[PDB]
């Protein structure tokens, strides 16, 4: 890690992610209003969910959207998640590490495809969530989706869920949340990367979290559980929220 800017230039970049929130650092944007999200309420379709040999990854359609403060619209790609097995989130927040963060990828609009967003400038947002467990129950909406990890717990397999409430995957306020300029969290790193972590969390049952850490197998054939990228400097960025 120490090692990827000799061939990673981004990666010895200012703006790296992920980062640790201090929450006393952060400033409050009164301009920035909401997330203004649309289509991604509960929807029949096609849901693609793989094991890519790091995470499982959910295919999204290009009706979900968002749009930024200022006005740019960001198209969902996919939605995947972060874990250990607390080692699991790659961002924290005042230190603190949390069991899981779930991460929906989206590209700007102004660009034909995803692949083009990737490499270029304003190409991605991150919408971001932290899991929290307590003595919570089983969290309705994740029941389909823990129910298929069994059918892909080697990498490279597929199922497929007919039907998906991405929204209610999602913690419970999504009015709420903190944005910083960043990158990508592993090589090549690059720097164009607009993030969202929500204030709010999602709830999991203790059992929801243990079947999303146990589940899948990677390739050399043992179960996934793997290095986060250390938190970054923040060097010259204020984290911004939409709330005081
Ligand atoms: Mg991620």
């Given amino acids: 890690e120490a090692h990827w800017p ?7 970049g200012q703006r790296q992610s992920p980062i640790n929130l201090q929450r006393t650092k952060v400033r409050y944007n009164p301009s920035l209003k909401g997330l203004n999200m649309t289509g991604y309420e509960t929807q029949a379709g096609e ?7 790091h995470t499982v990854q959910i295919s999204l359609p290009s009706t979900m959207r968002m749009t930024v403060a200022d006005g740019t619209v960001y198209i969902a790609q996919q939605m995947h998640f972060h874990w250990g097995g607390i080692s699991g989130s790659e961002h924290t927040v005042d230190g603190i590490r949390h069991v899981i963060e779930i991460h929906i990828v989206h590209y700007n609009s102004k660009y034909k495809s995803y692949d083009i967003a990737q490499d270029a400038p304003d190409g991605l ?3 971001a969530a932290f899991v929290e467990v307590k003595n919570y129950p089983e969290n309705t909406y994740y029941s389909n989706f823990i129910s298929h990890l069994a059918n892909i717990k080697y990498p490279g397999q597929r199922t497929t869920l007919t039907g998906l409430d991405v929204q209610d995957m999602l913690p419970r306020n999504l009015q709420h949340y903190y944005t910083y300029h960043g990158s990508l969290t592993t090589p090549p790193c690059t720097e164009n990367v607009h993030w969202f972590v929500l204030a709010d ?8 979290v243990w079947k999303l ?7 050399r054939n043992k179960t996934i559980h793997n290095d986060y990228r250390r938190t970054q400097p923040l060097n010259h960025r204020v984290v911004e929220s939409n709330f005081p």
Avoid: I, W
Wanted: one cysteine or more; a neutral charge.
């Fill in 6 to 12: 000799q061939h990673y230039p981004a990666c010895g």
């Fill in 125 to 127: 947002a991150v919408l």
């Fill in 213 to 219: 850490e146990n589940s899948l197998l990677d390739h």
């Fill in 47 to 53: 849901f693609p969910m793989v094991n890519n040999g």
């Fill in 201 to 208: 969390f999602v709830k999991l049952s203790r059992t929801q």
